[model samples]
Target: MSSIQILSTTTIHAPNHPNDYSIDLTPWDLQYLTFGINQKGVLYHHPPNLDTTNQIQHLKQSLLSTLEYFHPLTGRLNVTNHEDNTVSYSVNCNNEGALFIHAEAKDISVGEILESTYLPVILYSFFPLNGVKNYQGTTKPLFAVQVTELIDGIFIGCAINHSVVDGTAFWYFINTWAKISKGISPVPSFKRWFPDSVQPPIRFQFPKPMFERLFHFSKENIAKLKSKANLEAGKTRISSLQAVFTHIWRAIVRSRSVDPQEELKFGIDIGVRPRLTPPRKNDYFANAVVECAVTMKAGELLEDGGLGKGAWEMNQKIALYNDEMVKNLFENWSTTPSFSFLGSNLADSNSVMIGSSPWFDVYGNDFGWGKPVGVRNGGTNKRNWKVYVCAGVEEGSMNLEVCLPYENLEAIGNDSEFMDAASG
Candidate 1:
């Protein structure tokens, strides 16, 4: 085992031009953040036989180079230490105290380890050494990586701040780093994708009233919902985003099963990168701009009977609404008054939100070995948590990463259907 070291020390670079495409989210900071968990396999070549020392050093050099090229955006990855207004990025050294690499038995797969363990050490990067007493404490490290050698392969787990950029931007950065590791020269520049200047220098605003009103959810409510759901479905198959949404919606509907007039709506996080006009440049640093779209009321979808029917109908609505909603979100309509007025409202407060992306599989993050066996999402501060469904390379199937109030974990366990559906 080797210790982690901080290889470089740099300060945040504040550009003079307000219009610069740099991320401007205050308090949250980090423009983009992501981590890759790699699986260890039998070394295709011996660690000692294959110039391992040189390759490892080369890897560090490549990372430093990549950081140098993207230094202007480093602040986007750091936690906004409110007290000091400083951001921190912990660069794990090859053999330093801050960085620790453990060699596990060759029999356990990396995928299995991720699935079974909480990996708190990996998440420690998100907080200061003392840890955040409350969820709102933004003072934390911007990024951290955990490199562990398991039975099947070496795992690299990463954490990035979300305010700098969304998932698409994060994916772009990862792929570029991968390209650098391959000795690719002159990695593509991302300067053009900077956000267009806000005419008259507009101020940023969040829908505070709506966010405050709708974001609150109680643990008892989640528990009752889970309990009622288990009584209805003996079990479930397939836990894709679609499956999880269906199960949750069904549970919500069943819990309130007696209310025929009650209306239920779905709020899904739709990433708008693919739908942008003139196309978002490959390296854009600003927010890709996501919006929530709702579906027809549950009563409307369930007129035919059965949750599956309702789910299928919702899927169809989502397919059509996604295109329309995304187009509107990217068009001039985004600037319209109605855009700000849009909010998720339902008679039943148990609305479900699901976030989905396939960044781990296609991003070419090998770093010499190959793709990772698993990918997961953690470190959430929301009540109605987001769920990530990823494609598992080793399992040759899908795995789900869900973030919910810690209390709900047991109810999720008690619900055999929810557990089975999720595991599948």
Candidate 2:
């Protein structure tokens, strides 16, 4: 067993109480109404001269300064069921405070943690607020943090309400906190856009024994994938992610050996910041993302000339999810609202689906001590065929955290074509 000891738990309140207030969750936020808490963190090696106590003091003070601006996180989730049999969600600014736990794992090493073939299960324990759903924020703290001291390094994990923030906003808060801790000032815009929409709560859990593996891609490999897709498409339209995603999808499909004519789907989380009519701030604090899905025949995707075909299909859908499309989705949701539960078929492994992005600046969280040596998520929302893309510590590199069954992971690992482009 990976021995972990909990040292202390404290509630971090706003440095000063702000006026009591409430804000309704926008449509973008409601989409994740029943999703699990957002679990993400960064690991740092010991600083050359800084001591542990001083670093802890610095983090606590900066968090106090950070909470001053992100007060909503220190509040509670507010849910109201209307007479029409629909539910509305919002945050009640009660200043209930966020949970902060100081923990220790005295034997884990930074080198082993970063180079593991598969993520060590103990990494899941590094996070706080485990098993709490977004809707559970009504009773639990909306946000929680666990600062765990390791043998030669530290891990800072933050668990935020998924209904309150998407991956974009998730990193935005981390970036802000780091800047504040480093004595740099930064501000976030709180304005939100999107009309009212209600959805009944939906929930599900993953089956046991899921696995997560990290696949790294170098700048040269990404360039190769891009060139291959562009060469086939005979155009310069596909983005790096589009090309890489298409490649991964095809490999997964080939590994499964599915029927040629079977229908398959690929899903992606598309950020709607710039797609909004007037455009939301790139730093908008709440959720501003939508799920974009593409369907195709298994044969079509596995056949020759498929890389360019798949990339083109994804590019078309990406461009189509504009302002009008977002509004249309909202309009239709009012009539028949559907939520993406953890066990939903949206990420079926016959193909592949992706969340997060390589552009999120995941490595820029320096937090005064030094930049993070790596990034990771907790054991939540992971399922077969699910992937989370993160920016690597090195510039222009990408990390794909792939979750699948054991056999599928083995197949991907042995797939020569895939292994050729994936950096060891």
Candidate 3:
């Protein structure tokens, strides 16, 4: 079994020390961890070129430097306890020759390493990779970065433990790292934000019994409804995500197809960072402040429409769930006693959950190459019932990433209408 080698270590003081310090982990960090592995494009410019052997050497040196710069916190992973903070970074210099150095390398593919290796490592404790030696470990790290070379470009995959930092904090770390990698001076100091126990931390007082009862759906029901949806919707015109959810929701309705009276509902994860004019003013030390905007569902979106309606609805919903509303939701959710009423947890077992991270923007992730070709999220647990939509680079356009059960995916893939909608 191969392992990461450490070369040196040092500590950089948060621009403001003690009161303001660097590498402070939050409660959310405890749940989710992240990492990025990138492949360079053939046409893209590289700082230097090294043959395979030299490339390996450069990787070792680079990784050692990176880990030394940011050490993972030691001891138990507790967000509230900040006595000994450290960095969490690593490199797999030798990824079984599966790593893509040049963009054109053929063996690399999306989903392959992300699902098989990256997710397993990030969720190592909660969900250890079955039958893999030397891979077993605790979930304390909260995030793992993996770099692999693909045939065409570098693939940087980040496994972020979702529970730790929300998408906003994730981007802050990524962009900060990017600036550092480019030789920029004075990396953004994270000292501006310090965790504070809510003067009276808001309590979540949602009726748990009601929530639990409202979100129940059987697998068999989902499968049968999906089949009927394919037949009625003529599948070709829907997104893998929409088609799958349509099937599931219709199953809840016990109808093979979408009903005119049925109200379709969904939510989209939009990054609030960009909307900020000056951008860097907000203190990001806390958790769950990031927003999840809900959308209005009905009309053609429920009928013959597939990806088109879904996409249109997403845009409309996003606009409605703009920055101000997002901030309000974040504050309210955190403080309100019945915050769950605002929908932090999925209310419907059949509801769709769409989210995606900007892969290229993550910091210090260049892997001595260029940007990654693709990034994705995958795993299975009770949450599998929710439809997940993601966006990744596709033919230079931000393409949607959809993950559904195999049968639902097959139904959409085989439907001509779904294909046609997707192409458009």
| Model 1 collision count | 22
TM-score rank, highest first? 2, 1, 3
lDDT of 1 by residue, 193-238 (tens): 2234322111222221111110111333333334433333333321
Candidate 3's C-alpha runs over 4 A off are 1-50, 54-57, 64-139, 146-156, 168-186, 191-260, 274-278, 281-299, 304-316, 320-324, 337-349, 357-366, 369-371, 378-396, 421-424
- Tell me the lDDT of model 2 at 276: 65
Query: Could you tell me how far off, in angstroms, the CA of residue 23 lies in candidate 3 after the best superposition?
Result: 7.7
True-vs-predicted CA distance for residue 362, candidate 2, Å: 0.9
Note the Cα lDDT for every prediction shown.
0.39, 0.80, 0.34
Q: Note the clash tally of each candidate.
A: 22, 0, 63
What 10-residue stretch in candidate 3 is worst by lDDT?
208-217
**lDDT for position 161 in model 3:** 37
Which of the two, 1 or 3, has more TM-score?
A: 1
Writing each residue's lDDT as its tens digit, candidate 3 over 1-424 gives: 2122222322221121122122433222221222211111111122335333464345434433333323221111322322233222121111111111211234433343333311222221122121221111232233344434433233333333343345555454544444444333233323222224222222232131110001112334333434444555445333333444443333332222444555555644455544433455323422333434444344445455342444444434556766567545544543442211112233233355544433334223444445543333333211323433323333212333333343444444455544432421
- Local accuracy of candidate 2 as per-residue lDDT tens digits, 317-383: 8999877888777667645565667864333355567888887878888888788898987666666
